[PDB]
């Protein structure tokens, strides 16, 4: 948990300080020697005491609430001071004061454990207790996960749109006295049964029989001002501007619109219980016309208060069968074969009767069994079993299903608990980029620095995959099948928020501030619309800029985020960066998207930064002439900014692992490029070109043995030079784990063939290859590219083409998701039957051919009974090359005929580049030339 | 003279040139880090076809990288829309030049 996590990282930290700094001072080292032994004993003792819950430690837990948690901060306040400031100010006497508190804590551990009844594990501690950037790829996202979520979203559709019973209870069958009375029916269900989708079917299919209609969500806002404003928009029709209104007058406000009007409104996604009565009061008593009010809710007890009157009815979605539920469960664990555990298999299914077999509870328990492989005997049958309530009809509220999500939370291994809790600072249903989140975990320090000298980013990536693995965060895929964003489930957000506000880990401001002081310590604040010197993490979203204090009043701050905000050089907040000097502890200064005028001259005085993200700033032109003390930074992103690097300012920056967006002038590419031995990703832009510049770039790149991503581009309009690509292919050899290669410069595939037969370890990690200026694509070139075992995205263009045809072999391209071969007028493309097993999108061009078949034939590609896995659009160009319009029109129809019996029905598009679209005369007598 | 959306503001006299230049370049010619190659054909309104091409926050042209804005238009500068991926989809209509 939090108490052990915050302290478990200081032991390696101060151990490194002894190795790096404290070895110089013999007197201090002896004092820190006492500090080291007590910390090793104390934190390990807390782990042993960690079996006992925090709240039972009245002496200790309240002491975090008073001293220890602040002691873990004031120590960290001087630990970060030890490196530079204490090295200059010599604040040794502070250590004597603190070690006394730990000595009392050591005495407390001897006493508190003895008094509370815990085993005396202080003297028992002596008896019982006692280079490479890639440490270990812990896990990748399970391939079976993508298909499992696909079926679940498709399964909810079938189990939706079954409102035959729902229509029966609507009482809208004919004419009756009961039909003339008000009948407000409420529907309730679990979190995932899919009643929200179903409620639309009645709304759409009943439009004709009803004069007016309405549908507006409520969300997780327990307020009446928002819902009344939303309701009045579409009562039966728009009613002009009614923003300035009161809740009390809503009785009259709805009176002037529906005093005797047949009203049909639907309110969905509500967590409020008394709202039903309030609108009912505004709807008066039962009328004599006949109207229906349908409301859905995920909380039965809330809906019970909403639906507790005579005539009203409750309708809930059934559990997902007993046979169809096994499909969503047996796929995640045993993809191929299993006949060993069936009694435990079946009895674990019946456990879900507490919810009945709802989709959310099935995935959360199932995936906890297998993280990367199968597991030992479960033993879960003795903990949760059946005795945990019975929510078929009465415990289905936040009494039983909450416990199921709570059980999986406590089985997460150690450090993942603190990482998951941090996601509370984001709003509902937000988009969380993978790169931004991981680079923030490192800044605060939630990744244990294991193996002493490995990249923190890779270890952080391992944590994110494991969270994706079980159930905690839902992936959002992209082209070539990768997870570049994540989402949090609705109910899981509730569990995180309640657990976070109990331990006061993160404070969320609703928009008016929180009265937290003294005992209610403010530690990490998230802002979504004195005595605050103890804050150490502030985050602002681009809707609450108007409410923020100046930057001067901060002294221990660590993380400052202003992404997408309006800091810039506009508005009326006086938000100039001047005054950033008194912030000599920062670890994350993210000015992601503000219109920054000039970087402050004192920015270099903060010799502790690790990440600096200027993701987009058009008017930024120069870095300050003081960036030479930053020897602890890993991130530097400069894309979207036209900045010229100063001379001799980049050499002593020897901590980089990623650099995105720079230029080259004379020798910066050689004098101060090979020294950075820790660089892993490189993104560069070239302005001019000559042999005295490319030679320097190639020589430096040979000394970077730990590079895995490379991107090269050109800025000048003229690109007649072929020098850069040919020089790179003759000397440089790729490393063992090279991943990405993107280039827009003119290139040749003879150079790529050279790298293949030079590397001792053949290219087995190059997952992408983007080339937009290739000249020649020969038959021997396609086979070599098709033999790579990890390629996932290819895009090659062609110019000055001189070959007549190309074929894609059946035994070849294997893990390809995107194919973008678009050679010119020549090179008729003929796909080998039954190829590209996993392709999801293709683009292919064809031309006039001729001289290929003796007789006049319709233009035929290979597409009949081929590409059995297409999902998204398919694109085929068309080139005339001085041909007949009738032939071109035939080519358009011929291609569309083949992809019509495809048993997936993907969309098909076409585009005629020479723009044949004209007055449309068939006997056009040739159209144009290649231009 | 602006168009407001989820979190940004784009000056009106720049969306027009993006809607026009996208009908002179080739189709599926500019690759992207995510999503795919652009411009992409869209659904049909009042006949003809539509195209989509990304735009940047300030309003300049987009060459490569990542984007969260898009412009969809027809080949008359009559039906024009602004698209925002961001947190959630949000669509606004664009008036026509006169």
Q: What share of chain B is helix, strand, coil (3-state, %, to 5)?
A: 10, 30, 60
Residues 6+ apart with CB under 8 A from A660: A636, A637, A638, A639, A681, A683
Taking each helix axis as running N to C, give the angle between helix A58-66 and helix A68-83, from 0 to 180 degrees, rounded to the nearest 10.
50
Domain region containing A576: 508-620+630-641
For residues A371 and A469, the answer to whether their CB atoms sit within 8 Å is yes
**Alpha-carbon distances, residue A600 vs A242, A576, A578, A580, A646 (angstroms):** 47, 9, 6, 8, 16
Question: Which contacts (CB < 8 Å, 24+ apart) does range B87-91 have?
Answer: B87/A427, B87/A429, B87/A430, B87/A431, B87/B6, B88/A429, B88/B6, B90/B5, B90/B6
Q: Map residue A145 onto helix, strand or coil.
A: helix
Same domain membership, residue A213 and residue A244 = yes
For residues A657 and A679, the answer to whether their CB atoms sit within 8 Å is yes
Tokens of A799: 């110019």
Residues 6+ apart with CB under 8 A from A85: A91, A584
User: Facing residues of A539 across strands?
Assistant: A526, A561
Tokens of A929: 């030339």
Nearest chain B CA: its distance from A300 CA (Å): 29
DSSP output for A568-604: TT-TTS---STTTTS-TT-SEEE--S-------GGGG
Tokens 């590419």 -> residue: A669
Choose among A457, A487, A483: nearest CA to A471: A487
Nearest chain A CA: its distance from B16 CA (Å): 21
Question: Which contacts (CB < 8 Å, 24+ apart) does range A161-167 have?
Answer: A161/A197, A161/A198, A161/A201, A162/A198, A163/A198, A163/A201, A163/A202, A165/A315, A166/A198, A166/A202, A166/A315, A167/A202
For residues A553 and A438, the answer to whether their CB atoms sit within 8 Å is no
Say whether B31 and A820 touch across the interface (CB within 8 A).
yes
Question: Alpha helix locations (H) across A170-234?
Answer: 195-205, 225-233
Task: Put residue A174 in one of left, alpha, beta given phi > 0 → left and psi -120 to 50 → alpha.
Answer: beta
Tokens of A528: 């979504």
Tokens 């873990």 -> residue: A72
Choose among A36, A48, A50: nearest CA to A102: A36
- Cis ω for the linkage preceding A818 (within 30 of 0): no
Same domain membership, residue A784 and residue A931 = yes
Can you tell me the distance from the alpha carbon of A680 to that of A707, in angstroms, rounded to the nearest whole number? Answer: 4
Can you tell me the distance from the alpha carbon of A533 to that of A523, in angstroms, rounded to the nearest whole number? Answer: 10
Q: Please, what sign has the CA dihedral across residues A918, A924, A929, A930?
A: positive
8-state DSSP, A747: B
**Alpha-carbon distances, residue A346 vs A248, A329, A471 (angstroms):** 55, 11, 21
Same domain membership, residue A493 and residue A514 = no
Say whether A873 and B87 touch across the interface (CB within 8 A).
no
Burial of A168 (0-12, 13-18, 19+ CB in 10 A): exposed
Task: Tell me the HSE value of A149 on the side-chain side, using a 13 A CA sphere.
Answer: 15
Q: How many CB atoms lie within 10 A of CB A703?
A: 12
Nearest chain B CA: its distance from A715 CA (Å): 11
Choose among A602, A557, A627, A456: nearest CA to A80: A557
Strand A805-808 relative to strand A828-831, pairing: parallel
User: Facing residues of A589 across strands?
Assistant: A560, A612
Q: Please, what sign has the CA dihedral across residues A576, A577, A583, A588?
A: positive
Q: Where are the domains of chain B?
A: 2-94
Say whether A484 and B34 touch across the interface (CB within 8 A).
yes
Q: Which of A616, A770, A841 sits opposite B36 (nearest CB)?
A: A841
Strand A265-270 relative to strand A216-217, pairing: parallel
In SS3 terms, A281-340 reads as HHCCCCCCCCEEEEEEECCHHHHHHHCCCCCCCEECCCCCCCCCCCHHHHHHHCCCCCCC
DSSP output for A679-718: --EEEEEE-S--HHHHHHHHHHHTT-TT--EEEEEE-SS-
**Resolution in angstrom units:** 3.8
Same domain membership, residue A432 and residue A532 = no
For residues A300 and A195, the answer to whether their CB atoms sit within 8 Å is no
Q: How many CB atoms lie within 10 A of CB A829?
A: 18
Choose among A807, A859, A860: nearest CA to A835: A807
Same domain membership, residue A799 and residue A761 = no
Can you tell me the distance from the alpha carbon of A230 to that of A239, in angstroms, rounded to the nearest whole number? Answer: 11
Number of domains making up chain A: 6
DSSP output for A123-138: TGGGTTT---S-----
8-state DSSP, B30: B
Domain assignment present for A154: no
Choose among A594, A550, A558, A546: nearest CA to A76: A558
Strand A793-796 relative to strand A818-821, pairing: parallel
Q: Map residue A251 onto helix, strand or coil.
A: helix
Say whether B34 and A478 touch across the interface (CB within 8 A).
yes
DSSP output for A77-124: HHHHHHHTHHHHH---HHHHHHHHHHHHHHHHHHHHHHHHT---TTTG
Tokens of A500: 């976070």
**b/e A554-585 (16+ beta carbons within 10 angstroms → b):** bebbbbbbbbbbbbbeeeeeebebeebeebbb
Can you tell me the distance from the alpha carbon of A619 to that of A598, in angstroms, rounded to the nearest whole number? Answer: 8
Tokens of A185: 């029916």
Nearest chain B CA: its distance from A905 CA (Å): 16
Q: Map residue A911 onto helix, strand or coil.
A: strand
Same domain membership, residue A637 and residue A690 = no
Residue that terminates a domain, selected from A505, A522, A554: A505
Backbone angles phi, psi at A523, to 5 degrees: -110, -55
Can you tell me the distance from the alpha carbon of A334 to that of A371, in angstroms, rounded to the nearest whole number? Answer: 13
Residues of A in contact with B48 (CB under 8 A): none
Domain assignment present for A7: yes
Residues of A in contact with B37 (CB under 8 A): 795, 820, 843
Instruction: Using CA coordinates, name the residue in chain A closest to B42.
Output: A909
The domain that contains A472 carries what CATH number? 1.10.10
Query: Which residues in A have their CB inside 8 Å of a CB on B?
Result: 427, 429-431, 478-479, 484, 542-543, 564, 593, 616, 618, 639-640, 713, 770, 772, 795, 818, 820, 822, 841, 843, 873, 875, 877, 909, 911, 913
Total beta-carbon pairs less than 8 A apart between chain A and chain B: 46
Backbone angles phi, psi at A806, to 5 degrees: -135, 150
Can you tell me the distance from the alpha carbon of A390 to that of A447, in angstroms, rounded to the nearest whole number? Answer: 40
Tokens of A404: 């199921």
Nearest chain A CA: its distance from B97 CA (Å): 26
For residues A646 and A671, the answer to whether their CB atoms sit within 8 Å is no
Same domain membership, residue A204 and residue A248 = yes
Question: Which contacts (CB < 8 Å, 24+ apart) does range A349-354 have?
Answer: A349/A322, A349/A325, A350/A386, A351/A381, A351/A384, A351/A385, A351/A386, A352/A325, A353/A319, A353/A386, A353/A390, A353/A392, A354/A386, A354/A388, A354/A389, A354/A390, A354/A391, A354/A392, A354/A395, A354/A400, A354/A401, A354/A404
Can you tell me the distance from the alpha carbon of A404 to that of A354, in angstroms, rounded to the nearest whole number? Answer: 9
Same domain membership, residue A451 and residue A548 = no
For residues A440 and A559, the answer to whether their CB atoms sit within 8 Å is yes
Nearest chain A CA: its distance from B96 CA (Å): 25
DSSP element (H, E) containing A555: none
Query: Which residues in B have their CB inside 8 Å of a CB on A?
Result: 7, 26-28, 31, 34-37, 40-41, 56-58, 60, 64-65, 86-88
Can you tell me the distance from the alpha carbon of A138 to that of A140, in angstroms, rounded to the nearest whole number? Answer: 7
Can you tell me the distance from the alpha carbon of A47 to that of A202, in angstroms, rounded to the nearest whole number? Answer: 56
Instruction: Using CA coordinates, name the residue in chain B closest to A431.
Output: B87
Q: Give CA angle at A290 (A305, A252), nearest 5°.
A: 65
Can you tell me the distance from the alpha carbon of A445 to that of A456, in angstroms, rounded to the nearest whole number? Answer: 10
Domain assignment present for A559: yes
Same domain membership, residue A524 and residue A465 = no
Q: How many residues comprise chain A? A: 931
Tokens of A247: 């809740």
Backbone angles phi, psi at A133, to 5 degrees: -75, -25
Residues of A in contact with B87 (CB under 8 A): 427, 429-431
In SS3 terms, A881-903 reads as CCCCHHHHHHHHHHHHHHCCCCC
CA A486, chain centre distance (Å): 3
Residue that terminates a domain, selected from A505, A524, A557: A505
Residues of A in contact with B61 (CB under 8 A): none
Can you tell me the distance from the alpha carbon of A63 to that of A67, in angstroms, rounded to the nearest whole number? Answer: 5
Choose among A247, A283, A277: nearest CA to A262: A283
Task: Put residue A535 in one of left, alpha, beta given phi > 0 → left and psi -120 to 50 → alpha.
Answer: beta
For residues B87 and A430, the answer to whether their CB atoms sit within 8 Å is yes
Burial of A3 (0-12, 13-18, 19+ CB in 10 A): buried
Nearest chain B CA: its distance from A233 CA (Å): 18
Same domain membership, residue A715 and residue A732 = yes
Domain assignment present for A835: yes
Instruction: Using CA coordinates, name the residue in chain A closest to B36.
Output: A479
Q: How many CB atoms lie within 10 A of CB A254?
A: 22
Q: Which of B26, B65, B86 sits opposite A913 (nearest CB)?
A: B26
8-state DSSP, A242: -
For residues A379 and A407, the answer to whether their CB atoms sit within 8 Å is no
Instruction: Using CA coordinates, name the residue in chain B closest to A817.
Output: B36
Same domain membership, residue A874 and residue A823 = yes
Q: How many CB atoms lie within 10 A of CB A483?
A: 19
8-state DSSP, A189: -
Same domain membership, residue A733 and residue A866 = no
8-state DSSP, A180: G
Identify how the structure was determined: cryo-EM
DSSP output for A450-495: TTSS--HHHHHHHHHHHHHHTTSSEEE--TTS---EEE--HHHHHH
For residues A14 and A31, the answer to whether their CB atoms sit within 8 Å is no
Can you tell me the distance from the alpha carbon of A760 to that of A202, in angstroms, rounded to the nearest whole number? Answer: 65
Choose among A670, A662, A675: nearest CA to A694: A670
């Amino acid at each position: 948990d939090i108490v052990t996590g915050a302290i478990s990282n200081l032991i390696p930290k101060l151990g490194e300080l002894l190795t790096e700094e404290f070895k110089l001072h013999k007197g201090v080292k002896k004092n820190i020697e006492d500090l080291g032994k007590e910390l090793e004993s104390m934190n390990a003792a807390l782990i042993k005491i960690g079996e006992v819950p925090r709240e039972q430690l009245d002496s200790q837990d309240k002491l975090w609430a008073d001293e220890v948690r602040e002691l873990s901060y004031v120590i960290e306040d001087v630990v970060d001071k030890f490196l530079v400031q204490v090295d200059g100010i010599k604040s040794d006497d502070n250590n004597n004061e603190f070690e006394g508190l730990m000595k009392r804590t050591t005495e407390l551990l001897k006493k508190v454990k003895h008094k509370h009844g815990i085993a005396h594990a202080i003297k028992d501690i002596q008896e019982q207790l006692q280079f490479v950037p890639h440490p270990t790829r812990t896990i990748a996202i399970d391939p079976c996960l993508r298909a499992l979520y696909a079926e679940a979203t498709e399964l909810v559709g079938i189990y939706g749109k079954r409102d035959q019973g729902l229509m029966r209870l609507l009482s809208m069958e004919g004419d009756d006295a009961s039909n003339k009375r008000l009948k407000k029916v409420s529907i309730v269900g679990f979190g995932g049964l899919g009643k929200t989708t179903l409620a639309r079917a009645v709304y759409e299919k009943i439009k004709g029989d009803f004069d007016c209609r309405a549908f507006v969500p409520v969300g997780q806002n327990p307020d009446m001002k928002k819902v009344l404003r939303d309701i009045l928009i579409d009562l039966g029709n728009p009613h002009s501007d009614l923003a300035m209104l009161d809740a009390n007058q809503l009785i009259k406000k709805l009176h002037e619109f529906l005093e005797n009007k047949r009203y049909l409104v639907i309110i969905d996604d509500i967590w409020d219980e008394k709202l039903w009565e309030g609108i009912n009061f505004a709807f008066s008593n039962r009328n004599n016309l006949g109207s229906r009010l349908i409301t859905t809710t995920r909380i039965v007890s809330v809906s019970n208060s909403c639906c507790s009157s005579d005539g009203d009815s409750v309708y809930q979605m059934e559990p997902l069968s007993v046979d169809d539920s096994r499909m969503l469960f047996y796929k995640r664990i045993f993809p191929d074969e299993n006949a060993c555990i069936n009694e435990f298999e079946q009895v674990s299914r019946d456990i879900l009767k507490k919810c009945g077999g709802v989709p959310l509870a099935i995935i959360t328990i199932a995936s906890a069994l297998a993280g990367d492989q199968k597991m030992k005997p479960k033993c879960e049958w003795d903990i949760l079993l059946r005795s945990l309530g019975s929510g078929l009809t009465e415990d289905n509220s936040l009494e039983e299903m909450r416990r199921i999500l709570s059980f999986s939370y406590s089985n997460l291994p150690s450090n993942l608990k603190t990482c998951l809790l941090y996601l509370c600072v984001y709003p509902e249903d937000s988009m969380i980029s993978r790169d931004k989140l991981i680079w923030k975990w490192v800044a605060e320090g939630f990744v244990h620095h294991e193996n002493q000298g490995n990249s923190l980013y890779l270890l952080g990536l391992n944590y994110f995959n494991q969270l994706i693995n079980r159930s905690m965060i839902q992936p959002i895929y992209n082209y070539s099948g990768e997870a570049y964003a994540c989402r949090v489930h609705d109910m899981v957000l509730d569990l995180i928020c309640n657990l976070s506000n109990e331990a006061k880990f993160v404070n969320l401001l609703d928009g008016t501030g929180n009265s937290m002081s003294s005992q209610s310590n403010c530690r990490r604040l998230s802002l979504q619309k004195k005595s605050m010197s103890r804050v150490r993490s502030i985050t602002i979203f681009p809707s609450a800029i108007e409410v923020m204090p100046s930057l001067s009043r901060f002294d221990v701050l660590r993380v400052l985020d202003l992404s997408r905000c309006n800091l810039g050089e506009n508005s009326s907040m006086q938000l100039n960066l001047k005054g950033v000097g008194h912030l000599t502890h920062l670890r994350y200064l993210g000015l992601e998207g503000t219109n920054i005028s000039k970087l402050p001259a004192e920015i270099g005085k903060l010799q502790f930064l690790e990440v600096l993200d200027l993701e987009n700033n058009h008017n930024l032109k120069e870095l300050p002439s003081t960036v030479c003390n930053f020897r602890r930074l890993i991130y530097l992103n400069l894309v979207g900014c036209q900045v010229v690097p100063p001379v001799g300012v980049l050499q002593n920056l020897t901590s980089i692992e990623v650099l995105s967006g720079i230029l080259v002038s004379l020798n910066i590419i050689a004098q101060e490029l090979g020294n950075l031995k820790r660089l892993r990703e490189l993104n560069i832009l070239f302005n001019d070109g000559s042999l005295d510049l490319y030679e320097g770039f190639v020589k430096s790149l040979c000394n970077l043995h730990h590079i895995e991503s490379l991107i090269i581009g050109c800025n000048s309009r003229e690109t007649s030079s072929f020098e850069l690509m040919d020089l790179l292919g003759e000397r440089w050899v790729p490393p063992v784990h090279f991943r990405e290669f993107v280039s827009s410069m003119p290139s040749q595939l003879s150079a790529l063939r050279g790298w293949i037969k030079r590397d001792p370890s053949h290219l087995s990690n190059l997952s992408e290859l983007i080339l937009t200026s290739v000249k020649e694509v020969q038959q021997d070139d396609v086979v070599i590219i098709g033999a790579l075992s990890s390629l996932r995205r290819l895009c090659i263009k062609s110019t000055y083409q001189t070959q007549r045809l190309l074929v894609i072999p059946a035994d070849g391209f294997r893990c390809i998701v995107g194919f973008h071969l678009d050679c010119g007028s020549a090179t008729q493309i003929l796909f080998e039957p039954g190829a590209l097993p996993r392709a999801e999108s293709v683009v292919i061009s064809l031309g006039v051919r001729v001289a290929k078949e003796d007789g006049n034939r319709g233009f035929d590609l290979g597409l009949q009974g081929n590409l059995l896995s297409l999902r998204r659009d398919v694109f085929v160009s068309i080139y005339c090359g001085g041909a007949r319009v009738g032939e071109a029109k035939e080519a358009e129809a011929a291609v569309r005929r083949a992809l019509d019996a495809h048993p997936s029905h993907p969309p098909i598009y076409f585009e005629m580049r020479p723009h044949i679209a004209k007055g449309a005369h068939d006997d056009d007598l040739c159209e144009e030339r290649r231009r | 003279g602006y168009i407001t959306l989820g979190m940004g503001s784009i000056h009106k006299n720049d969306i027009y040139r993006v809607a026009e230049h996208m009908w002179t370049i080739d189709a599926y010619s500019v690759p992207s880090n995510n999503h795919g190659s652009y411009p992409i054909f869209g659904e049909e309104i009042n006949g003809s076809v539509t195209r989509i091409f990304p735009i940047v926050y300030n309003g300049d042209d987009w060459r490569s990288g990542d984007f969260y804005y898009s412009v969809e238009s027809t080949e008359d500068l009559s039906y024009i829309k602004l698209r925002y991926n961001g947190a959630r989809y949000e669509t606004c209509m664009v008036s026509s030049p006169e």
